[PDB]
Amino acid sequence: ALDVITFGEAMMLLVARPGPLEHAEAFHKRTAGAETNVAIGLARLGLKVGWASRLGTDSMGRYLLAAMAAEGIDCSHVVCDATQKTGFQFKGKVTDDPPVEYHRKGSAASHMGVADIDEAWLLSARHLHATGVFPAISATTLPAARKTMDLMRAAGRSVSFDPNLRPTLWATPELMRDAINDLATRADWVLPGMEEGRFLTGETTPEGVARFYRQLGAKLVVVKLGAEGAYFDGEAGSGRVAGFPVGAGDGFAVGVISALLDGLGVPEAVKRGAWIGARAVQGLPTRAELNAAK
Amino acid sequence: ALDVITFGEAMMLLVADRPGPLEHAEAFHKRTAGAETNVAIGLARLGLKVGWASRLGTDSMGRYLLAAMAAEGIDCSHVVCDATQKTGFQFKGKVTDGPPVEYHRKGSAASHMGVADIDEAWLLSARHLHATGVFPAISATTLPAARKTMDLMRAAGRSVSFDPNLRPTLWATPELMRDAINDLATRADWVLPGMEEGRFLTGETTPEGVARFYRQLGAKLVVVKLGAEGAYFDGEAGSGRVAGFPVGAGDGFAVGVISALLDGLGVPEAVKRGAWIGARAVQGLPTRAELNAA
Ligand SMILES: [Cl-]
């Protein structure tokens, strides 16, 4: 019925002329949200994607739905609730990364829990993408992310996990590490950045990060090495993939998930991610631009 | 030490840059909103010593509100900027002609105010308190504080102004609205109703009636606003009508009549000031200078 499903929060991003936020007279709308950025990537590459979440019925919320719908994303499981609020966020202009101010405590998406899961619908998908953002949002969402991956594993469906770190969202670094690595226990594909891997695992090498996720029971670990590319450790074996010259994480995740699902090999999937990773840090490609690059 | 104190919530006003519905906007401009504050900005531009009391977050919107209120000359020493609480905000669309506000003010820092917030010595140090129907309508903790704010200022024989604004969305039953606004009327020297509001509040259909309703509840002055028709006034020295000029306007009106009476002008010249500023606002609250032209 559907290639990929994600659970997460989307927010309206108001982007400021530079200086401090209080001094800006004008803002432009954009869209923000970690899982939704991967959603958009996969949709633009012609995959069938559904997004689950909550939103208020307010104008911000209405804008988010439209933006998501217009990218080609099934939003049937975005409960709109007039009793709750959408989140939003401010970013200033950078001339020299602009600091982002967030307004999302108590948002509709933070109220999600296990009761928000529609099992039959989850299962109608080939693949679940999961991130360390959604589970971090609140006390209810962490269990909801657990059940989501569990449900999907037991149905013999692909589970993808990108151990994103947002220290702002978790009580203590220790708590984040325990929650992230415990969730990695429920994934088939684990996609860690090298710096997050050092942090989560204490391993100083890509091979070390990967063995760590394999030992917690994971068929595939791809470690992102930045300029030097990526390293991968799977049931077929191991190797490195060179990457590109020169945000990059999301694009890299759009890369491997989309390739592994199109039936491509693991080195070839990693190449795609390197390509979209490099490419978007400039902007998430369509199939048109994909095919054009080789 | 201060001419006038008000209590109330300011919010940040985001204005759509083009006439569409809100969700289809692409840019917004920054302004201030809030009934008590608009009155405060006008009185301050007319030269009066005005102190404002409120709560705001220490988020960027809060810091904007504090700074835009202070660049007007308003005494902000009693604005608590509480880092644990959130700043209110709103959206307005542009009207090609025909606009609707979307308010985001539930559970805001200002809604948390109560009697504990009032600094008695500080209040008493101003000649006059100006009050509205909004502040008391904000949360269950603000009504007590409006009531008490007025009580205090009267017993000390200071001057109290009341503008019976109706905001139904803010009140639980319409009837409570009527009971509360009218019970507050019990605590003002000067009551500033609009005919429409007065008809709802009092049941009367002629100004002379609306006026005698609030005289009987113990007001020294009622000035009933009539639109382009001007105003009717009913006070201890006598009654009358003022023409009113030709072509937001309530707020101008009260800035006009409050500043004149505190400036030492008689009631009838005060209502015409009120009336000039009101009509100006329909077309931007005047400097003393713009005022001295006419
Ligand atoms: Cl208001």
CATH of the domain at B206: 3.40.1190.20
In A, which residues are within 8 Å of B102 by CB distance?
Answer: 58-59
Tell me whether residues B60 and A26 touch, CB distance under 8 A: no
Say how far apart CA B61 and CA B38 lie, in whole Å: 17
Q: Tokens 């998406």 identify what position?
A: A109
Tell me whether residues B30 and A14 touch, CB distance under 8 A: no
Query: Long-range pairs for B239-245 at CB < 8 Å and ≥24 separation?
Result: B239/B208, B239/B211, B240/B267, B240/B268, B240/B271, B242/B268, B242/B271, B242/B272, B242/B275, B243/B272, B243/B275, B244/B272, B244/B275, B244/B278, B244/B279, B245/B275, B245/B276, B245/B279
Say how far apart CA A255 and CA A253 lie, in whole Å: 5
Q: Which residue of B has its CA nearest to A91?
A: B60
Contact between A107 and B104 (Cβ < 8 Å): no
Tell me whether residues A27 and B25 touch, CB distance under 8 A: no
Contact between B17 and B91 (Cβ < 8 Å): no
**Distance to chain A for B211, nearest Cα, Å:** 40
Contact between A239 and A206 (Cβ < 8 Å): no
Q: Does B28 touch chain A (CB under 8 A)?
A: yes
| Mutation for testing the A interface, residue in B23, B28, B84 having most A CBs under 10 Å | B23
Helices A34-44/A59-69 angle, 10° precision: 30
Say how far apart CA A164 and CA A162 lie, in whole Å: 6
Of the candidates A270, A253, A277, the one whose C-alpha atom is nearest the C-alpha of residue A4 is: A253
**Distance to chain A for B290, nearest Cα, Å:** 26
C-alpha pair distances (Å), A231 with each of A212, A237, A243, A244, A252: 14, 11, 10, 14, 13
Say how far apart CA A115 and CA A143 lie, in whole Å: 10
What tokens appear for B49 in the block?
Answer: 């010593």
Please give the resolution of this entry in Å, rounded to 1 decimal: 2.7
Q: Tokens 């904007």 identify what position?
A: B64
Indicate the SS3 state at residue A288. helix
Surface-to-core class of residue A244, CB atoms within 10 Å of its CB (0-12 exposed, 13-18 middle, 19+ buried): middle
Tell me whether residues A62 and B23 touch, CB distance under 8 A: yes
C-alpha pair distances (Å), A271 with each of A37, A242, A262: 19, 8, 14
Surface-to-core class of residue A19, CB atoms within 10 Å of its CB (0-12 exposed, 13-18 middle, 19+ buried): exposed
Contact between A138 and A113 (Cβ < 8 Å): no
C-alpha pair distances (Å), A68 with each of A7, A38, A72, A86, A91: 13, 12, 7, 15, 21
Residue among A22, A28, A62 minimizing CB distance to B64? A22
Of the candidates B254, B52, B255, the one whose C-alpha atom is nearest the C-alpha of residue B149 is: B52
Cα of A136 vs its chain's centroid, Å? 12
| Dihedral pair phi/psi, residue A274, rounded to 5° | -50, -45
Interface of A with B in 39-98 (CB under 8 A): 58-59, 62-63, 66, 85, 90
Q: Does B103 touch chain A (CB under 8 A)?
A: no
The CA-based angle A73-A78-A79, given to 5 degrees, is 160
Cα of A235 vs its chain's centroid, Å? 24
What tokens appear for B56 in the block?
Answer: 């705001």
- The string of DSSP codes covering B60-108 is HHHHHHHHHHHTTT-EEEEEEE-TTS---EEEE---S----EEEE-TT-
Q: Which residue of B has its CA nearest to A24?
A: B30
Contact between B210 and B248 (Cβ < 8 Å): no
Domain limits for position A164: 1-294
Say how far apart CA B166 and CA A93 lie, in whole Å: 40
Contact between A258 and A272 (Cβ < 8 Å): yes
Confirm whether A250 is a catalytic residue.
yes
What tokens appear for B167 in the block?
Answer: 């905001």
What tokens appear for A56 in the block?
Answer: 């208020």
Q: Which residue of A has its CA nearest to B93?
A: A59
Contact between B275 and B223 (Cβ < 8 Å): no
Residue among A25, A62, A90 minimizing CB distance to B29? A25
* Domains identified in chain B, total number: 1
Contact between B167 and B134 (Cβ < 8 Å): yes
| Dihedral pair phi/psi, residue A276, rounded to 5° | -70, -30
Q: Which residue of B has its CA nearest to A106?
A: B107
- Counting one residue from A and one from B, how many pairs have CB atoms under 8 Å apart? 50
The CA-based angle B28-B31-B34, given to 5 degrees, is 130
Tell me whether residues B60 and A14 touch, CB distance under 8 A: no
AA identity, residue B17: D
In B, which residues are within 8 Å of A66 by CB distance?
Answer: 23
Contact between A259 and A290 (Cβ < 8 Å): no
What is chain A's percent helix, strand, coil content, to nearest 5? 40, 25, 30
What tokens appear for A15 in the block?
Answer: 């982007």
Contact between A18 and A25 (Cβ < 8 Å): no
CA of A71 to the centre of ligand 1 (A): 37
DSSP classification of residue A284: P
What tokens appear for B262 in the block?
Answer: 């505190």
- B194 forms beta bridges with B225
